[PDB]
Design a protein around this motif. Structure first.
Motif, PDB file in Angstrom:
ATOM      1  N   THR A  64      -6.050   8.011  36.470  1.00  0.00           N
ATOM      2  CA  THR A  64      -7.382   7.959  35.845  1.00  0.00           C
ATOM      3  C   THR A  64      -8.432   7.242  36.688  1.00  0.00           C
ATOM      4  N   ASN A  65      -8.040   6.679  37.825  1.00  0.00           N
ATOM      5  CA  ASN A  65      -8.969   6.146  38.806  1.00  0.00           C
ATOM      6  C   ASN A  65      -9.113   7.073  39.997  1.00  0.00           C
ATOM      7  N   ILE A  66      -8.000   7.615  40.490  1.00  0.00           N
ATOM      8  CA  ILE A  66      -8.077   8.606  41.546  1.00  0.00           C
ATOM      9  C   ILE A  66      -8.558   9.939  40.986  1.00  0.00           C
ATOM     10  N   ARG A  67      -8.440  10.152  39.670  1.00  0.00           N
ATOM     11  CA  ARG A  67      -8.977  11.369  39.075  1.00  0.00           C
ATOM     12  C   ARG A  67     -10.493  11.352  39.043  1.00  0.00           C
ATOM     13  N   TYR A  68     -11.095  10.178  38.847  1.00  0.00           N
ATOM     14  CA  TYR A  68     -12.545  10.086  38.934  1.00  0.00           C
ATOM     15  C   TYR A  68     -13.016  10.291  40.364  1.00  0.00           C
ATOM     16  N   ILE A  69     -12.251   9.793  41.336  1.00  0.00           N
ATOM     17  CA  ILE A  69     -12.588   9.992  42.742  1.00  0.00           C
ATOM     18  C   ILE A  69     -12.450  11.460  43.123  1.00  0.00           C
ATOM     19  N   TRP A  70     -11.427  12.136  42.596  1.00  0.00           N
ATOM     20  CA  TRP A  70     -11.254  13.567  42.835  1.00  0.00           C
ATOM     21  C   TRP A  70     -12.388  14.378  42.225  1.00  0.00           C
ATOM     22  N   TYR A  71     -12.849  13.979  41.040  1.00  0.00           N
ATOM     23  CA  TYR A  71     -14.004  14.629  40.432  1.00  0.00           C
ATOM     24  C   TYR A  71     -15.264  14.375  41.239  1.00  0.00           C
ATOM     25  N   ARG A  72     -15.487  13.122  41.620  1.00  0.00           N
ATOM     26  CA  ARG A  72     -16.752  12.720  42.210  1.00  0.00           C
ATOM     27  C   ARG A  72     -16.899  13.226  43.639  1.00  0.00           C
ATOM     28  N   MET A  73     -15.789  13.412  44.359  1.00  0.00           N
ATOM     29  CA  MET A  73     -15.856  14.066  45.664  1.00  0.00           C
ATOM     30  C   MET A  73     -16.284  15.519  45.537  1.00  0.00           C
ATOM     31  N   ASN A  74     -15.789  16.215  44.512  1.00  0.00           N
ATOM     32  CA  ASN A  74     -16.170  17.608  44.303  1.00  0.00           C
ATOM     33  C   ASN A  74     -17.635  17.721  43.915  1.00  0.00           C
ATOM     34  N   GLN A  75     -18.125  16.771  43.121  1.00  0.00           N
ATOM     35  CA  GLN A  75     -19.519  16.794  42.706  1.00  0.00           C
ATOM     36  C   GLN A  75     -20.451  16.507  43.873  1.00  0.00           C
ATOM     37  N   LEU A  76     -20.037  15.643  44.799  1.00  0.00           N
ATOM     38  CA  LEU A  76     -20.841  15.367  45.979  1.00  0.00           C
ATOM     39  C   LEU A  76     -20.798  16.491  47.003  1.00  0.00           C
ATOM     40  N   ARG A  77     -19.758  17.327  46.997  1.00  0.00           N
ATOM     41  CA  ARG A  77     -19.777  18.505  47.858  1.00  0.00           C
ATOM     42  C   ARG A  77     -20.719  19.565  47.309  1.00  0.00           C
ATOM     43  N   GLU A  78     -20.712  19.761  45.991  1.00  0.00           N
ATOM     44  CA  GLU A  78     -21.584  20.757  45.386  1.00  0.00           C
ATOM     45  C   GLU A  78     -23.037  20.314  45.415  1.00  0.00           C
ATOM     46  N   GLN A  79     -23.284  19.007  45.349  1.00  0.00           N
ATOM     47  CA  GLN A  79     -24.651  18.507  45.399  1.00  0.00           C
ATOM     48  C   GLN A  79     -25.223  18.611  46.806  1.00  0.00           C
ATOM     49  N   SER A  80     -24.369  18.573  47.825  1.00  0.00           N
ATOM     50  CA  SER A  80     -24.822  18.647  49.205  1.00  0.00           C
ATOM     51  C   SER A  80     -25.212  20.052  49.641  1.00  0.00           C
ATOM     52  N   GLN A  81     -25.015  21.059  48.798  1.00  0.00           N
ATOM     53  CA  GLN A  81     -25.397  22.432  49.098  1.00  0.00           C
ATOM     54  C   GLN A  81     -26.096  23.060  47.900  1.00  0.00           C
ATOM     55  N   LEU A  82     -27.047  22.321  47.328  1.00  0.00           N
ATOM     56  CA  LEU A  82     -27.726  22.754  46.114  1.00  0.00           C
ATOM     57  C   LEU A  82     -28.898  23.687  46.387  1.00  0.00           C
ATOM     58  N   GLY A  83     -29.515  23.599  47.563  1.00  0.00           N
ATOM     59  CA  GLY A  83     -30.664  24.429  47.864  1.00  0.00           C
ATOM     60  C   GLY A  83     -30.336  25.557  48.817  1.00  0.00           C
ATOM     61  N   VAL A  84     -29.352  25.327  49.681  1.00  0.00           N
ATOM     62  CA  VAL A  84     -28.884  26.338  50.619  1.00  0.00           C
ATOM     63  C   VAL A  84     -27.913  27.265  49.904  1.00  0.00           C
ATOM     64  N   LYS A  85     -27.545  28.364  50.560  1.00  0.00           N
ATOM     65  CA  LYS A  85     -26.517  29.248  50.033  1.00  0.00           C
ATOM     66  C   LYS A  85     -25.169  28.537  50.012  1.00  0.00           C
ATOM     67  N   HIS A  86     -24.356  28.872  49.014  1.00  0.00           N
ATOM     68  CA  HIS A  86     -23.081  28.198  48.809  1.00  0.00           C
ATOM     69  C   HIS A  86     -22.076  28.679  49.848  1.00  0.00           C
ATOM     70  N   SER A  87     -21.659  27.777  50.726  1.00  0.00           N
ATOM     71  CA  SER A  87     -20.643  28.055  51.727  1.00  0.00           C
ATOM     72  C   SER A  87     -19.312  27.446  51.305  1.00  0.00           C
ATOM     73  N   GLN A  88     -18.239  27.965  51.887  1.00  0.00           N
ATOM     74  CA  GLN A  88     -16.901  27.517  51.535  1.00  0.00           C
ATOM     75  C   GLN A  88     -16.555  26.231  52.273  1.00  0.00           C
ATOM     76  N   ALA A  89     -16.043  25.256  51.532  1.00  0.00           N
ATOM     77  CA  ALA A  89     -15.694  23.963  52.094  1.00  0.00           C
ATOM     78  C   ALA A  89     -14.240  23.941  52.548  1.00  0.00           C
ATOM     79  N   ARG A  90     -13.919  22.949  53.372  1.00  0.00           N
ATOM     80  CA  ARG A  90     -12.536  22.703  53.747  1.00  0.00           C
ATOM     81  C   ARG A  90     -11.745  22.216  52.543  1.00  0.00           C
TER      82      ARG A  90
END
Lengths: 277, 180, 277, 277, 277, 180
Positions: C207-233
């Motif tokens: 429940t602590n690493i699960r928040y980190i797993w969520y928040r990493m995904n949210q920061l990847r999606e936020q980093s490509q909010l205006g550009v076209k969605h590209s596939q991440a590693r």
């Protein structure tokens, strides 16, 4: 470090006479209504996916199993919100809500703002049974609508069943409410500046209301970072089993624990709300 | 308001307690269902019910467990009073040989305020009866005769049983230690 | 939806040849070192407060019991960090670290950045045993110091025992690390833009690493909010028991689950790290 | 003007029978434990800053070199306190403490208060080896805690390694302890009114214990400024080399010098503590 | 972190134009006057007590050997102050003071306050040689006397040889000047609020001026404890060998170190005082 | 790599399994300690061990439990094989009357992939021996004689016991259902 019923009654009455007491009602407040669990409802929907009900419950918490429906079978998640609306707001739950002393003692007081985290309509419907008016506030369109100043505003902190896109039930939806960006969250940011809170119907092992208890304390300390530190209004948490370590933690989060009588759960909450009057 | 809460699920254990400690203003009564540990040793079971019942109610709790140790069964039933009662009600006076009948009825209280557990144990030496006799008791009171009498527990009255039963001497010790 | 050892080995090798694989090591990585639990250590310190050790463990989680020492007896919390430093970094733990195949297979690879969440020194000390240089990064003064580009940077995500004010062990310290404002958090914000992560040594109920797993995904999606969605590693999580519902949740958090052989825990992790070479 | 072993033995015994003798133990008391110097430890930490170990020792005293870590590289000062806790309180130092005749002769007496200026735990651990109870007093939270009257109170005058913020090791921390405002200092202000002190394990060129020797004498004379001058209890200082000028200075600071046999340092201290019994 | 001659010259000139620069002169300022050591003088007085001069110097520092005369042979301590007054203020020392470029460059500037710690009269006598007026301030009767505002006030911080009861030379007298209760100390408490100091003629291993350097910094920080922290005027310390660790310590005591040319000691101090003009 | 994992804690139950299903490449072996439920009914216990063992290992698991039902003790010990073995090793052939000796040895497997549990139950009707005879077995194999023979389980070899024991017919059924 734990208040009793008679010790906390003049403390709650002083906050209520000057209009600075807001109830914050949990799932234990809807306990006398004999509602289904929801974890029982999500387990019976898993029979179509090949799960036994005791085996599907094994694979995680309730918000984690609802995460599984949100990504692998989205029509079953909408089925879950559908049959909670038929069950939590049924006519049998209204009839128990008429005779519940907890809901009568809540509606006997002229509140200004009531917070609740459960999805059912029985916090407003208690106020409608006493002949009082209530305004449900869950979405942005609810805040934009007009209302009178006499009306008690009931903010659905985790959504309402009649607005299914406001429901906070998936695990990812709980994680994104930790940023406090929803319209119920922005209303909470301004109400903690002026009010004291009465938390009723939670457990110490919830881990979601504990983050809210932490984050309210952090927003009070952040609001007086440059000025001299003044004393804030004390919040309250009514419990039937307080324990021995957890009430000391809650003292540093500006929350006093009230030990209620554990022999009858519903009666001791009703004696608390009637001592405020 | 009470300070100590007695947690029990048997409806007849509650009626005997309230005959003795019913007038005390500082003893409450709870009926929370806790998962029973199964073990032969009474000291092990009563010490594990107090953790399991404090987790359920989170108030200073008092728990209770009984035992029936038969020499013929080499200590059985023991604290395993549950799985034998669901299988041998009072036919347990038949399955043991008729030559050696001696046994001990044992009881245990444990009160836990959250910081420490305290165990009280009494014991009555007796001998098992040839047939089930009596109605006024619980779990083996028709088939247990204490040493000295000719009469079972369930053939006795409630005042007569609590002057012989292990649970009667425990409730007097519980009054003076907790100040009830 | 779960990779095996042989299926994930060319996927991890492709990320490692171009230098974009970062291990993220948990408490299960220090399991062969036979360290004390910490929950056992905090229970024995509670004897001076009048608690039995099995009774003090009843009143909450480990970070909640450490919250109790932080506010009611602060000299016992510093005693806890003291005797973890004597126990987790003892000479007996170093001798097991010499012969551990997990720590040898970790140090046989030329990593650029290694993340770890445990307090002991055995991630860097594995690299020192292989004749390699490591740089510990826990506080602001560690990042400011000079170092060479050849040196693998080991970021202590929850602090180090030789810098006791960096330790994240109190419950309030876990809650304020959810805002991601610490110097290990700011380094994580830039590394998720370019790298893939290998999570080793966690459970699904953390429940602590699960928040980190969520928040990493949210920061990847936020980093490509205006550009076209590209596939991440794609990130990875090595497990010995994957379950049946939890690997599907992790797919939407950009994390593939690798099922390792549960018969020998330490050997199957070592075969994973040697297949990257 | 120097006492011998047999001359000082009835003087120390008279103070001990009426409970007015307090040992004040220095760094020379931990000499048989074969501990590292600390000046050797701080020199090896200076290799990361570009210093040779013999060259870094040239630039000042030990407390001045620790001042340099406190302001230019604060993570190395916490590293120094970390690896003194691994070294001064190791299992090898405990095994020598079991067989040390100095530590056995100290614990054979029923003391009421023991002062010490060294950071290690071997003054209390000597009392635990004799089956006696000891109470460590270093911070404000230690004095506030409850204890029995039978327990010998061991006051850590310069801090303890398990409470790293109590350590007096930086030069600026030595200068601000000259004002006598710490909780070990306030306890010393009341104990000099009633007790005699036995200083063991210091040198005449310390310049920190010399200020304490001066300031204790000044506080005795200040405590009888309006009343008639009465004779105080005489303090004591056990030495192996007394010299020829320094014992006359110490006479005016209410301290008699005891010349011990310099052939075996540890045995002659042990014969002193056994003559008190 | 060390200023040169040309870098510190506009910094000292800015403090001098607005009248906020006070010299604080040490024993190295009287070095070209070829005075006796004092440690040589106290060793030759010990011949009457049966000491060889090299053997009496072995038993402690100079202030500790003067402590021995203060308590065991008080007529020899007054003999020491007597023959320092014949030696430090002789006619041969005045003739070297006429031609000393350090003393000429000091007196060429219109100072308001000059502090000095040495007992001889050659700081005022430098001002009398330039035709300027000086006021010696050592005792309470000196401050009470009248004077003009044009006159530079020379405060003898450790006494003057013409007032022998003001001399701070015994070790106990150095320890009781650490409380800062003398009339030169009370004048220093008010001058540090407004002025910057130029320390000339000290060593880093003095341990008496280091306490003064610490205590001045503590009194500046204490004087702004409730108000917002403003930047203070920077003090200065002129040195011929600065070292490598000690200038960084002095930065945190509000003191910048000025490296002077070590080839000629007296000339480089004279070039510093002439760059202020 | 295996697909199914057999979880056991007894060291002799593992040696008999690997004599039969040891050559199968798709059966792994785990020794995770799980908390044993105590109940008389074998169907209840084996169905509750599969939840308790899947929570521990989180792989498709196979569990096992045995039973010994004595007519004299009215179906006891039943699935309570742990508390009687910790009290009556082979003295259990003494505490039952010598007139009626008949009993049934029962065993149960349950495999759980996470979605559903499947229970296999075999049974051997026999009669308890007058004295403990033999060494080669586990838990009651010296005192149990099957119907038809004169010889106990522990007096038999390993190949002879698995042609009579309940755990021998279960392991052949487990091979064909899971395809081991």
């Amino acid at each position: 470090t734990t208040l009793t019923l008679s010790e906390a009654a003049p403390l709650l009455k002083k906050e209520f006479r000057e209009g600075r007491l807001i109830p914050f009602l949990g799932a234990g407040f809807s306990k006398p209504l004999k509602l289904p669990d929801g974890s029982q409802l999500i387990a019976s929907l898993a029979k179509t996916l090949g799960f036994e009900p005791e085996l599907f419950d094994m694979h995680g918490r309730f918000e984690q199993l609802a995460e599984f429906f949100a990504i692998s079978a989205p029509n079953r998640l909408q089925r879950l919100v559908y049959e909670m609306s038929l069950s939590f707001d049924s006519a049998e739950a209204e009839a128990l809500r008429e005779k519940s002393p907890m809901h009568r003692a809540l509606a006997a007081l002229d509140w200004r703002t009531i917070y609740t985290t459960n999805y059912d309509k029985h916090v407003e419907g208690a106020l409608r049974d006493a002949g009082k008016q209530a305004a449900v506030l869950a979405s942005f369109a609810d805040f934009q609508g007009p209302r009178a100043r006499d009306v008690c505003e009931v903010i659905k902190f985790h959504g309402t069943l009649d607005q299914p896109d406001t429901i906070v039930l998936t695990e990812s939806s709980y994680f994104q409410r930790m940023a406090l960006d929803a319209p119920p969250d922005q209303r909470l940011r301004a109400d903690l500046l002026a009010n004291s809170f009465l938390f009723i119907g939670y457990s110490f092992s919830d881990t979601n209301i504990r983050y809210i208890w932490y984050r309210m304390n952090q927003l009070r300390e952040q609001s007086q970072l440059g000025v001299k530190h003044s004393q804030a209004r004390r919040c309250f948490f009514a419990t039937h089993g307080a324990g021995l370590v957890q009430p000391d933690i809650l003292q540093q989060w500006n929350i006093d624990v009230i030990q209620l009588d554990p022999t009858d759960k519903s009666a001791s909450v009703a004696r608390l709300l009637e001592s405020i009057a | 308001a009470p300070t100590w809460f007695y947690n029990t699920t048997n409806s007849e254990k509650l009626r005997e307690l309230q005959h003795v400690l019913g007038g005390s203003a500082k003893l409450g009564y709870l009926t929370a269902k806790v998962t029973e540990i199964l073990d032969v040793d009474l000291e092990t079971v009563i010490r594990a019910k107090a953790i399991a019942a404090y987790r359920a109610v989170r108030v200073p709790v008092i728990v209770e467990h009984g035992a029936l140790c038969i020499d013929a069964l080499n200590g059985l039933p023991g604290a395993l009073v549950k799985p034998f009662w669901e299988s041998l009600d009072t036919r347990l006076c038949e399955v043991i040989p008729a030559g050696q009948r001696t046994a001990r009825a044992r009881g245990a209280l444990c009160y836990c305020d959250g910081r420490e557990r305290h165990v009280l144990i009494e014991e009555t030496e007796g001998e098992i009866a040839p047939s089930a006799r009596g109605t006024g008791g619980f779990h083996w009171d028709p088939i247990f005769i204490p040493k000295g009498q000719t009469r079972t527990f369930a053939e006795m009255s409630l005042d007569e049983k609590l002057s012989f039963s292990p649970l009667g001497r425990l409730h007097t010790r519980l009054r003076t230690e907790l100040g009830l």
